[PDB]
């Protein structure tokens, strides 16, 4: 025909005229160019075409015009049905050596044409996103070493950013699925070092630490996938006891990482950048997270006590921008509260600016808690969300911000809203404000809140007195005791 099916190229490939069959390929792929869907009435024809194409693959490919076969195996690889006709041993190894990322089946390599590297990396990530036995084999065929070598070794090279983008995406797709791949990338490769060098070369940290707030659009993309894989390495291998040779590169990662929260992306990507950057800041070690409250100081933002805290104001602005979404909160405002908690839990003079931003001296207006539209009324309403993790991080964020005391916590929030936190770990009759925290009696409020029985001891402001228009006829609740057992 003119826009023919895979059935026509099935009986056209058996008449293997090379220019005619590449004409059939080059006319097929431009028709089905970026369509993510297909038809279902030609399915076994597509399966037989896949078998024929991997016969061509595992027998070896042409010297020239190989990019046509690579384009067609990419554009057929996007099908959901033809996974089991691709996920074989010699097919994956052929795609690896045409991707120049294999450990064996390699000479001292020819200077590679980047087009086949784009198509082969696209084929690899498409093949690992589906077909889980291809993930198990790509773990088993040891592909990660040349990927790590390549991403570490364009400190001094000039690649197109699409190549590094798809290479990092393949590294991420490997590390997000096989625990052996991430345990190989973390310990016995120490890839955190080289991936942070790639993070530097994406960022470009220098003097004039971001007055030019624009970060380029493609560079935000590859830095975003860098942050993806860097979170994907060290999420389970966090060590609460470390050494200076271990923690020194961690602290270096932090010192370059503080630059990321400040700047803005292009388009609307500036949310997603911080939305993964704070996730990377989540699992860093606690004893060397103190670069947030220890950066350089200058006349930009007003400081609190010897040190600028503008990154913490940026974190609070990110929290206010990230709170009123209410769809998927456990993945968006859990690590932010964890970062601000473990920032405030270790050194005092950041919690004072945190306290001045989240706990103003309460005027105690005729509104309750959790009924207004501010920070306190949002998050203490969030304290009784149906997800265990969001409550577990928000109640700890307000238990640290009250400097860990049974008063000055229900005075601000409410026993009715924080009794679950207190029941979790709070009632011990031990009295732990941890000694070093600022024991100031001056928490007497602005409008001078009234007596201990005027306000609700479980809720907020003065509302009324109970009428109670009753007499006699007591002892009603007698049903729970025989059914508790």
């Amino acid at each position: 025909g003119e826009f023919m099916e895979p059935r026509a190229v099935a009986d056209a490939l058996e008449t293997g005229e090379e220019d005619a069959v590449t004409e059939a390929l080059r006319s097929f792929n431009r028709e089905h160019s970026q369509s993510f869907t297909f038809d279902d009435a030609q399915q076994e024809d597509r399966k037989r075409l896949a078998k024929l194409l991997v016969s061509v693959l595992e027998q070896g490919l042409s010297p020239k015009h190989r990019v046509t076969w690579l384009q067609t195996i990419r554009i057929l690889s996007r099908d959901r049905s033809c996974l089991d006709s691709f996920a074989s041993r010699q097919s994956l190894h052929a795609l690896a050596c045409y991707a120049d990322i294999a450990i064996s089946e390699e000479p001292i390599p020819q200077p590679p044409d980047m087009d086949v590297l784009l198509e082969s990396l696209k084929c690899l990530c498409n093949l690992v996103l589906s077909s889980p036995t291809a993930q198990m084999l790509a773990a088993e065929a040891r592909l990660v070493v040349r990927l790590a070598e390549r991403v570490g070794l364009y400190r001094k090279r000039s690649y197109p950013h699409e190549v590094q983008f798809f290479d990092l995406r393949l590294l991420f797709l490997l590390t997000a699925l096989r625990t052996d791949v991430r345990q190989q990338l973390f310990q016995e490769l120490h890839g955190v070092r080289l991936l942070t060098d790639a993070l530097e070369l994406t960022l470009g940290v220098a003097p004039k630490e971001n007055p030019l707030v624009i970060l380029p659009a493609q560079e935000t993309e590859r830095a975003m996938e860098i942050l993806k894989v860097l979170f994907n390495i060290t999420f389970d291998s966090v060590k609460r006891e470390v050494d200076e040779e271990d923690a020194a590169l961690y602290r270096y990662l932090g010192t370059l990482l503080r630059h990321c929260v400040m700047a803005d992306a292009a388009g609307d990507r500036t949310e997603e950048f911080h939305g993964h950057t704070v996730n990377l800041l989540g699992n860093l070690p606690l004893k060397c997270l103190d670069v947030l409250l220890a950066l350089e100081l200058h006349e930009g933002s007003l400081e609190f006590m010897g040190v600028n805290m503008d990154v913490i104001n940026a974190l609070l602005a990110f929290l206010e921008k990230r709170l009123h979404q209410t769809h998927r909160l456990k993945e968006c405002v859990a690590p932010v509260l964890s970062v601000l908690t473990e920032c405030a839990r270790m050194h005092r003079p950041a919690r004072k600016f945190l306290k001045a931003q989240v706990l103003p001296p309460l005027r105690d207006v005729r509104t309750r808690p959790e009924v207004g539209d501010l920070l306190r009324n949002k998050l203490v309403r969030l304290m009784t969300h149906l997800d265990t993790d969001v409550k577990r991080v928000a109640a700890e964020f307000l238990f640290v911000l009250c400097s860990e005391s049974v008063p000055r916590f229900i005075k601000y929030t409410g026993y009715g809203n924080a009794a679950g936190l207190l029941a979790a770990r709070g009632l011990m009759a031990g009295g732990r404000p941890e000694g070093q925290y600022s024991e100031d009696e001056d928490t007497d409020t602005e409008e001078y809140r009234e007596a201990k029985a005027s306000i609700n001891p479980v809720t907020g402001r003065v509302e009324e007195k109970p009428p109670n228009p009753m007499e006699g006829m007591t002892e009603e609740q007698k049903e729970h005791e025989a059914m508790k057992l």
């Binding site: 993510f36 996007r78 696209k122 498409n126 996103l129 995406r169 991420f172 797709l173 997000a176 699925l177 993806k228 979170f231 994907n232 999420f235 389970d236 996730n279 699992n283 998927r328 456990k330 993945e331 859990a334 690590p335 009784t384 149906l386 997800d387 265990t388 993790d389 409550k391 577990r392 049974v406 008063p407 026993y415 009715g416 809203n417 009794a419 679950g420 029941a423 979790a424 770990r425 009632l427 011990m428 009759a429 201990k452 001891p457 479980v458 809720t459 009324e464 109970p466 109670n468 009753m470 007591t474 002892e475 009603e476 609740q477 049903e479 729970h480 005791e481 059914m483 508790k484 057992l485």
Partner: protein, 184 residues
């Protein structure tokens, strides 16, 4: 000035955990259920918050089935209707402890929530099932003007110095990165 820990619960089913976990302000240990008379329970309090009975989220299929009469969570709703809508608790507040989340999450990948009632219509995840249970327990009370009620889905985890149990948020953000990435 811890004013009212009016505690109660289904005793050896979830409430053993709460009586083990309840050990300027101090607090007393008092009145777990005892069998005092009206001369001692004239005022149980002045109308202050009763920390409500445990609901273990596991008796919902573990029926106290002497005749397969009724699952114990519906009996819990019945005694909740007795407790909450009494006129002697007019201006109060009520703290729900939806307890023992773990086996509820384990059983939502099992025999579905037909055991509560066939009025249920959620898609058998944990979120919408717990939302339906919270919705039934809150709208079992109707007036909500002088009595506001607060619900807590606790986990009853070992809260000690180990964060391997904190893996769930990391699994969520990894799987969300996996869903958010796609073919191209």
């Amino acid at each position: 000035r811890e004013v009212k820990l009016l505690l109660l619960g289904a005793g050896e089913s979830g409430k053993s955990t709460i009586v083990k976990q309840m050990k300027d302000l101090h607090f007393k240990m008092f009145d777990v259920g005892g069998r005092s008379e009206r001369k001692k329970w004239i005022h149980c309090f002045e109308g202050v918050t009763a920390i409500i009975f445990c609901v273990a989220l596991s008796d919902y299929d573990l029926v106290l089935a002497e005749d397969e009469e009724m699952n114990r969570m519906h009996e819990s709703m019945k005694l909740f209707d007795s407790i909450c809508n009494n006129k002697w608790f007019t201006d109060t507040s009520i703290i729900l402890f939806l307890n023992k989340k773990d086996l509820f999450e384990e059983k939502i990948k099992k025999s579905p929530l037909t055991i509560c009632y066939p009025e249920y219509a959620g898609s058998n995840t944990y979120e919408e099932a717990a939302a339906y249970i919270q919705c039934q327990f809150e709208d079992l009370n109707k007036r909500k003007d002088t009595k506001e009620i607060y619900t807590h889905f606790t986990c009853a985890t070992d809260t000690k110095n180990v964060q391997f149990v904190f893996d769930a948020v990391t699994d969520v953000i990894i799987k969300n990165n996996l869903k958010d990435c796609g073919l191209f």
